[PDB]
Amino acid sequence: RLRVLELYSGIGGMHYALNLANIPADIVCAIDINPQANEIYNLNHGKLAKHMDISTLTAKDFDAFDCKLWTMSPSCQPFTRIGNRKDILDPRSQAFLNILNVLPHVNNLPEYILIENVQGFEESKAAEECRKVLRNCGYNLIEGILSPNQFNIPNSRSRWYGLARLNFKGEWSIDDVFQFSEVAQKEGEVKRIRDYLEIERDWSSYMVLESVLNKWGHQFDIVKPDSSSCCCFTRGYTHLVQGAGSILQMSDHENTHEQFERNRMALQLRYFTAREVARLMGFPESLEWSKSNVTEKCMYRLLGNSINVKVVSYLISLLLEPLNF
Numbered sequence: 001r002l003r004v005l006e007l008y009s010g011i012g013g014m015h016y017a018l019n020l021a022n023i024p025a026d027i028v029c030a031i032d033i034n035p036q037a038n039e040i041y042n043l044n045h046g047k048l049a050k051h052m053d054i055s056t057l058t059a060k061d062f063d064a065f066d067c068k069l070w071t072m073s074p075s076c077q078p079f080t081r082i083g084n085r086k087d088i089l090d091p092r093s094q095a096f097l098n099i100l101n102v103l104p105h106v107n108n109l110p111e112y113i114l115i116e117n118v119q120g121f122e123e124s125k126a127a128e129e130c131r132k133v134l135r136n137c138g139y140n141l142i143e144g145i146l147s148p149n150q151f152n153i154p155n156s157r158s159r160w161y162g163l164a165r166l167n168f169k170g171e172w173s174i175d176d177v178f179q180f181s182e183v184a185q186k187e188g189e190v191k192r193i194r195d196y197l198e199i200e201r202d203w204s205s206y207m208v209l210e211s212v213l214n215k216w217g218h219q220f221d222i223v224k225p226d227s228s229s230c231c232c233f234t235r236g237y238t239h240l241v242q243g244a245g246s247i248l249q250m251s252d253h254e255n256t257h258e259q260f261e262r263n264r265m266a267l268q269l270r271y272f273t274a275r276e277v278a279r280l281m282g283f284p285e286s287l288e289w290s291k292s293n294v295t296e297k298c299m300y301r302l303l304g305n306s307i308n309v310k311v312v313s314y315l316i317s318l319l320l321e322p323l324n325f
């Protein structure tokens with residue numbers, strides 16, 4: 001079976017994607033500094049997540065893990081750091097550079113590496129350093145930008161992905177991943193928002209406040225159940241308006257802008273629930289947090305930093321093909 005090290009594990013999107021890809025995978029360790037993430041991780045996947053600063057990992061640590069696949073969703077922003085006080089710096093994006101500095105020292109280089117990051121990572125100095133050390137350590141690296149709405153998922157979430165195979169001299173391309181998306185177009189199989197919504201819940205706690213709608217309401221992106229996309233969810237969702245996620249019109253008004261000026265409260269606008277956000281990001285229904293100390297408000301923040309499980313399941317399948325499972 002494949003021993004996997006899941007770095008920057010969060011609530012375990014990578015583990016869920018490995019499950020979908022039917023990889024016989026043993027997550028040897030999941031590492032995250034956020035105890036709230038680890039609490040959700042361990043409740044759902046088993047006690048595999050450990051509290052550890054990835055910037056302190058040594059080659060002896062990686063040797064003990066002895067993992068053939070490493071996954072990571074590192075924290076690399078800001079891509080260009082400012083400031084002369086390199087003395088007092090907390091290890092932030094130092095953790096990713098620590099991985100790159102320690103990798104050439106391990107006893108057994110991992111045969112497969114999967115890296116996920118935000119769009120624009122590809123132009124960063126960190127990406128330049130990553131390509132350099134991977135090339136020097138004999139990896140074949142392919143990379144690309146992919147969004148769920150390329151796979152018939154009605155959500156925008158463009159992300160950079162790097163897939164690396166050690167000592168691989170064949171031919172592959174990130175675009176091969178589309179041979180896995182069963183999706184086609186018939187217009188009745190095109191997924192829309194309604195396919196992810198919860199139904200007949202009490203929406204009171206999710207209704208957008210009139211105070212926010214009166215002050216900033218023109219900045220919302222409003223979608224309806226029949227919409228074929230919605231905007232990217234972030235940590236700011238339900239707190240910051242612009243650029244943090246779309247909201248849902250529950251009323252039947254066809255002309256949303258016209259009704260907005262007439263009476264914006266009659267649009268019955270609500271936030272997506274955290275369950276709906278999880279569904280749009282490809283998490284299965286088994287994902288649970290009710291039995292934890294983690295509130296739905298905190299779940300929005302954890303989900304805002306999570307991968308799309310569906311997209312990564314396809315990339316994992318592509319990455320691990322030479323293992324002939």
Ligand SMILES: Nc1ncnc2c1ncn2[C@@H]1O[C@H](CSCC[C@H](N)C(=O)O)[C@@H](O)[C@H]1O
Pocket residue numbers: 008009010011012013014031032033034037052053054055073074075091092095305306307
């Ligand atoms: N130096 C460091 N050491 C360990 N974990 C870190 C870290 N810096 C950031 N992280 C963690 O890395 C995660 C980046 S978001 C990744 C979440 C995960 N990919 C998922 O799908 O759920 C956050 O949970 C954050 O707590």
